[PDB]
Design a protein around this ligand. Structure first.
Ligand SMILES: CCCCCCCCCCCCCCCC(=O)O
Ligand SMILES: CCCCCCCCCCCCCCCC(=O)O
Ligand SMILES: [Ba+2]
Ligand SMILES: [Ba+2]
Length: 130
C-alpha cells in the first residue's frame, strides 16, 4: 500500500513569510527559504510513512505510523508528539502547536495546507520522476 510514495517538488506556495514569522523561524532562513522550490520524498508502506523534505542545505527526515503517536520535527527544529490520520487513501491530516496540516495527493499533485489561526499556508507540489 503505497498511494503517497514518490518524489515531488514545490510549484507554488501562499503565505510562506507570514506563517514562518508566526511559528518562530529565524528571519534569515525565512529570507533564504521563500523562493526555494523544495523537494519532498515520501515512502508509504501500508500505514508506515517516511518523508524527507529538502529546502536548500536543510534536510528534515520524518516518520510516522497512521493512527499512532509519532514525533514530528517541524521547520524550527521543534519535535512535536502527535497523531497523523488518514482520511481516505489520499489525505493525511494532523494537528500540532495549534496548526492544522492537511496533505492531499491528487494524481501527481500534492496540496499541503497548514492553518494557524487566520493564516492559511498552502503549498502545491508536482511529481518529479521516481
Ligand atoms: C540552512 C539551509 C539554507 C536554506 C534553509 C531555508 C529554510 C527552508 C524553508 C522552506 C520551508 C519548506 C518546508 C515546509 C514543510 C511543509 O509545509 O510540510
Ligand atoms: C515540517 C513537516 C511538519 C509535519 C507535517 C505533517 C506530516 C503528515 C504529512 C506528511 C507529508 C509532508 C508534506 C510534503 C508536501 C510538501 O512538502 O509540501
Ligand atoms: Ba491513491
Ligand atoms: Ba495532535
Amino acid at each position: 500500500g503505497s498511494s503517497f510514495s514518490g518524489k515531488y517538488q514545490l510549484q507554488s506556495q501562499e503565505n510562506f513569510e507570514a506563517f514562518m514569522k508566526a511559528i518562530g523561524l529565524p528571519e534569515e532562513l525565512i529570507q533564504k527559504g521563500k523562493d526555494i522550490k523544495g523537494v519532498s520524498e515520501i515512502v508509504q508502506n501500508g500505514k508506515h510513512f517516511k518523508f524527507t523534505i529538502t529546502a536548500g542545505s536543510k534536510v528534515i527526515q520524518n516518520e510516522f505510523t497512521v493512527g499512532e503517536e509519532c514525533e514530528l520535527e517541524t521547520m524550527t527544529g521543534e519535535k512535536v508528539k502527535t497523531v497523523v490520520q488518514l482520511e481516505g487513501d489520499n489525505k493525511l491530516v494532523t494537528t500540532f502547536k495549534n496548526i492544522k496540516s492537511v496533505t492531499e495527493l491528487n494524481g501527481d499533485i500534492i496540496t499541503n495546507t497548514m492553518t494557524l489561526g487566520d493564516i492559511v499556508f498552502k503549498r502545491i507540489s508536482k511529481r518529479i520522476g521516481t
